[PDB]
Design a protein around this ligand. Structure first.
Ligand SMILES: O=C(O)c1ccccc1O
Ligand SMILES: O=C(O)c1ccccc1O
Lengths: 140, 145
């Protein structure tokens, strides 16, 4: 039926497809001169939707945890993509803002990611997307 | 690139996210599965042993290709697996540079009790997914890329 061999394959494919996809996309960013990771692009996506999100919300949005998200954010700050501000209401609590460089990169990075998305999913039909997704949702 | 039937980018992005967040939630779930249960063994240790139990005495080339992955990391974990006393290297009787990987005694004894655990975790992991869905999932994932 769905014996251990298949479940182990499934799990294995899921993890490796995920890794390949992150890594191919990062390579395509680098090929075009953008030295960013997939993690940076995801976080930037949140920020292009809503500037000045608190650190705290952003770690909840992240699909990652606080220690890993915070490290990733330091790198981005170091790359000049965002700044960190002492809050207008509080202290020990920051807001995360786009720099101009961070805003400038919406168009170009989203374009590269589109190109990468269309090719990577060319063999999949539109209608398979919610099936795939609803399976992933019910795993674990 | 293009076509007369394009998918919406946002949908592909959301699905890519779901793929990735789910892979992570799954690795998290499985992190301590041997350790909480009395075997000081990682996930990576385990996935390599699966290849070894299937093909004991495989070439470190074919293994690094089996693993897909980064050779130093594949190799680096191999190293802990030597140190823990799970595997060792004998040198391939073809070249003087090509290696071969072989399970230690623990390595072979560990098959049953570690597969037993992983089976029970896998079953749990996929318990709300149906029999027909499994090869569908799997076929989608193969076609991605
Ligand atoms: O990747 C693993 O080590 C694993 C563990 C338990 C069940 C399925 C799996 O692929
Ligand atoms: O969840 C992620 O880190 C991610 C990975 C690849 C593409 C888009 C993403 O949001």
């Amino acid at each position: 039926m769905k014996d251990f061999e298949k479940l182990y394959e499934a799990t294995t494919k899921l993890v490796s497809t995920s890794l390949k996809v992150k890594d191919d996309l990062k390579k395509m960013f680098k090929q075009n001169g953008y030295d960013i990771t997939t993690d940076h692009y995801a976080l930037l996506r949140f920020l292009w939707e809503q500037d000045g999100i608190s650190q705290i919300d952003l770690c909840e949005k992240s699909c990652k945890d606080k220690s890993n998200t915070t490290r990733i954010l330091d790198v981005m700050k170091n790359k000049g993509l965002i700044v960190r501000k002492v809050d207008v209401k509080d202290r020990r609590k920051f807001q995360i803002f786009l720099t101009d460089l961070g805003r400038e990169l919406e168009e170009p990075l989203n374009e590269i990611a589109s190109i990468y998305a269309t090719e990577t999913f060319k063999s999949i039909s539109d209608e398979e997307l919610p099936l795939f997704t609803d399976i992933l949702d019910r795993i674990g």
